[PDB]
Amino acid sequence: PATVCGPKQSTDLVKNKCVNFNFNGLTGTGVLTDSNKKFQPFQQFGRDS
Amino acid sequence: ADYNYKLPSEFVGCILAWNTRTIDSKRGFYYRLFRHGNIRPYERDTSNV
Amino acid sequence: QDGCATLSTKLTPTQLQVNSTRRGFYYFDDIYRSSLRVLVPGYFLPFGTNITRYQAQVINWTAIFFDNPVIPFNDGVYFAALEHSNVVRGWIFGTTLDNTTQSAIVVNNATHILISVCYFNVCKEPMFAVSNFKPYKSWVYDRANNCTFNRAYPLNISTTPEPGKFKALREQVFRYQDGFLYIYHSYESINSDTLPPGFSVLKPMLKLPLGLNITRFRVVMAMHSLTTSNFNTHSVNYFVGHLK
Ligand SMILES: C=CC1=C(C)/C(=C\c2[nH]c(/C=C3N=C(/C=C4\NC(=O)C(C)=C4C=C)C(C)=C\3CCC(=O)O)c(CCC(=O)O)c2C)NC1=O
Ligand SMILES: *[C@@H]1O[C@H](CO)[C@@H](O[C@@H]2O[C@H](CO)[C@@H](O[C@@H]3O[C@H](CO)[C@@H](O)[C@H](O)[C@@H]3O)[C@H](O)[C@H]2NC(C)=O)[C@H](O)[C@H]1NC(C)=O
Ligand SMILES: *[C@@H]1O[C@H](CO)[C@@H](O[C@@H]2O[C@H](CO)[C@@H](O)[C@H](O)[C@H]2NC(C)=O)[C@H](O)[C@H]1NC(C)=O
Ligand SMILES: *[C@@H]1O[C@H](CO)[C@@H](O)[C@H](O)[C@H]1NC(C)=O
Ligand SMILES: *[C@@H]1O[C@H](CO)[C@@H](O)[C@H](O)[C@H]1NC(C)=O
Ligand SMILES: *[C@@H]1O[C@H](CO)[C@@H](O)[C@H](O)[C@H]1NC(C)=O
Numbered sequence: 001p002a003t004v005c006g007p008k009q010s011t012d013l014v015k016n017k018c019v020n021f022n023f024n025g026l027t028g029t030g031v032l033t034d035s036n037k038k039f040q041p042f043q044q045f046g047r048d049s
Numbered sequence: 050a051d052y053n054y055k056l057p058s059e060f061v062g063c064i065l066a067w068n069t070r071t072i073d074s075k076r077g078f079y080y081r082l083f084r085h086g087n088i089r090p091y092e093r094d095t096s097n098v
Numbered sequence: 099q100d101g102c103a104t105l106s107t108k109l110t111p112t113q114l115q116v117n118s119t120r121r122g123f124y125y126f127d128d129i130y131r132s133s134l135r136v137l138v139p140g141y142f143l144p145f146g147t148n149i150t151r152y153q154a155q156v157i158n159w160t161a162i163f164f165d166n167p168v169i170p171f172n173d174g175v176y177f178a179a180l181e182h183s184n185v186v187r188g189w190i191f192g193t194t195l196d197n198t199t200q201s202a203i204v205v206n207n208a209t210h211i212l213i214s215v216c217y218f219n220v221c222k223e224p225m226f227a228v229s230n231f232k233p234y235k236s237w238v239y240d241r242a243n244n245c246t247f248n249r250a251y252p253l254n255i256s257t258t259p260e261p262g263k264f265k266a267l268r269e270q271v272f273r274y275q276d277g278f279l280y281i282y283h284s285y286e287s288i289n290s291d292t293l294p295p296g297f298s299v300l301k302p303m304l305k306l307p308l309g310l311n312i313t314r315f316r317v318v319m320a321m322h323s324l325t326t327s328n329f330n331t332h333s334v335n336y337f338v339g340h341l342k
Contacts, residue, residue, distance in 0.1 A: 043130060057276055091277030093309040095244065096199060 001042060052081045057090040101240030103329075105223050109163030114151040116293070118143065118339055122176040124271050124282040124300040141273070141341045143176045149339035154185070154319055154331060162331045164223075168195070168316050174341035175315070177270040178293065183259040184208070185334035187226060187320040191279075191312045195220055200246070200310050202279070205318060208233050208257050215308055216245030228323030231258050238318060247308060259324055261332055264291055271300055273341075277309045293337065 002024050013032075020029050026045060037046065050056075081094065088094060122143035152165035169175075171191070179186050188205030195201060197219045204213050207226070224238040267288055273280040281304040288294065317336065322329040 040130075046130070046132075048132075049134075089276075091307075091309055092311065093246070094311075095246070098198065 001044070051087045052084045052094075053088075055088055055090045055092070099239065099242065100235045100237055102221060103223050103225065103227075103237040105162070105164070107161035107163070109161070111152055111165040111167060114153075115148045116151050116337065118145070118147050118149045119293075119295040120145050120297045121178070121269065121293075122271065122300075122339065123298070125302055141174055143339055143341055147339065149176070149337055151335065151337050153333070153335050154321060155333035156331060164319055164321075164331070166223075166317050166319055168314055169338060171272070171274075171312055171315050172340065174271070174273045176339040176341065177272065178337035179268050180264045180266070180291075180293065180335045181268070182263065182265040183261060183321075183332050183334075184255055184257065185319065185321045185332065186317065186336060188318040189315055190220065190224070190318060191310070191315050193311050193313050195314065195316070197241070202247075202308055202310055202312075203238070203318075204281075205238070205320075206253070206255065207236070208255050209252070210250045211253050213247065213249050213306060214242070214245065215247035215310060216242045218242050224318045224320070225322050226320030227329055228257055230324060230326055233257060234323070236320070238320075247306075249306075257323070259332055263289055264335075265289065267293065269298065269300060272315075274312050277307055279306045279308050279312075280304070281306075 005024070008022075015032055015034075018029070018031055021027065021032065024044065039046070084094070126138060126140055152167075154162075154164050156162045187208075188203060190201060190203055192201035193199050197217055199217070200215055201218045201220070202213070202215045203218070204211070206212070208228075218239045219241040220239055221237055226236045226238070227234040265287055267286050269284045271280075271282040273282075280302070282300040283303040284298055284300040319331075319334070321331045321334060324330070324332060
């Protein structure tokens with residue numbers, strides 16, 4: 001979990017569109033959809049092979 | 050860097066320094082000058098033997 | 099912090115040796131992995147090695163013999179304990195273990211877990227004292243000065259003994275790197291009088307910024323807590339091994 005963060009303004013969740021995203025400093029480009037995955041309590045993202 | 054305060058080689062972070070002539074021009078500030086061997090990173094020695 | 103206590107009934111430690119099976123593995127990093135097979139170098143306790151055993155109980159001749167020597171802490175330590183009445187409360191880490199150098203204490207007051215770093219005057223026998231079944235006094239050191247670190251985590255544990263069989267096995271791994279003390283922990287409840295063979299992996303618990311030279315430790319046996327004004331001990335066992 002993030003404990004110290006910089007002064008940025010948040011926007012609205014836009015779903016099912018090719019967008020640029022910034023989650024807690026993790027940046028990228030793609031399409032965001034709902035998930036049926038499960039995380040551990042102090043985990044923030046998941047990576048594949 | 051050998052007897053008082055040592056940073057690790059893989060340091061990540063920032064360093065700030067500034068002059069304080071008008072508030073700290075007094076007696077009572079010491080540094081260690083003799084010691085057998087060097088200290089390891091992020092270690093303290095408060096002995097006065 | 100109350101101070102002083104003296105034990106003449108003592109006897110020489112036996113220093114038994116036991117097999118280590120396949121115990122003493124831990125999570126060595128903070129990277130989440132899924133369905134992957136990796137090769138890792140590091141410091142671990144080898145499989146099948148010998149490790150050392152000490153005990154504590156009143157045998158019969160109006161006398162109690164404990165076992166708290168001073169052990170080396172080279173590259174890291176694996177610790178194990180078999181107990182049934184909340185016996186082994188804490189450790190002492192340092193270099194000379196006297197009032198000329200800083201020392202670190204990790205203990206339990208049956209109400210909190212306490213971690214402090216200062217110029218301690220250690221006693222000849224560190225232990226707590228309960229009033230039959232009431233946390234009475236604590237005699238671990240008499241004076242502490244010029245003191246750097248202090249922290250406590252609330253953890254209330256039961257102080258009513260249930261002697262007989264062994265009901266708990268607790269395992270720990272201690273590491274030191276870059277001013278940080280790393281404590282990994284694992285716990286289970288079993289009903290047996292040896293250490294079962296198996297393969298157990300220990301989870302991270304604490305990462306403490308102490309900034310102190312550590313080369314030696316000893317065990318605090320605060321067992322003496324079950325009497326009135328006379329104070330003697332129940333039984334317990336513990337095991338020590340190293341890392342390579
Ligand atoms: C100093 C305290 C100490 C403890 C409690 C510890 C960690 C620890 N001991 C646990 C179980 C336990 N095992 C013990 C026994 C201990 N009490 C002791 O003084 C020692 C050395 C242990 C070792 C584990 C206790 C008190 C519990 C029960 C905790 C509870 O009530 O949840 C648990 C699981 C339950 C919980 O999260 O509270 C942790 C994390 N390591 C330690 O060194
Ligand atoms: C531990 O704590 C004690 C008390 O705070 C520290 O004692 C103090 O030590 C300094 C020197 O480091 C003393 O200063 C010296 O005092 C004498 C006269 O007493 C003077 O002649 C010297 O020129 C110098 O000023 C200070 O007096 C002393 N104070 C007390 C109350 O003892 C001690 O240094 C600490 N030890 C450490 C470094 O952990
Ligand atoms: C130390 O413990 C290990 C683990 O139990 C023992 O290894 C077993 O040894 C038997 C007999 O050779 C084998 O059949 C098992 O397959 C082994 N298991 C494992 C996991 O190694 C080892 O023999 C013990 N050594 C001593 C001297 O007691
Ligand atoms: C383990 O203990 C046995 C018996 O004392 C000894 O022969 C052996 O060298 C020791 N080392 C091992 C294999 O762990
Ligand atoms: C330190 O311990 C020694 C030996 O017990 C004692 O003589 C001395 O007075 C103690 N000094 C302090 C710092 O209390
Ligand atoms: C234990 O807790 C009691 C009651 O809060 C307190 O008086 C005492 O100082 C504590 N002792 C230790 C060793 O922490």
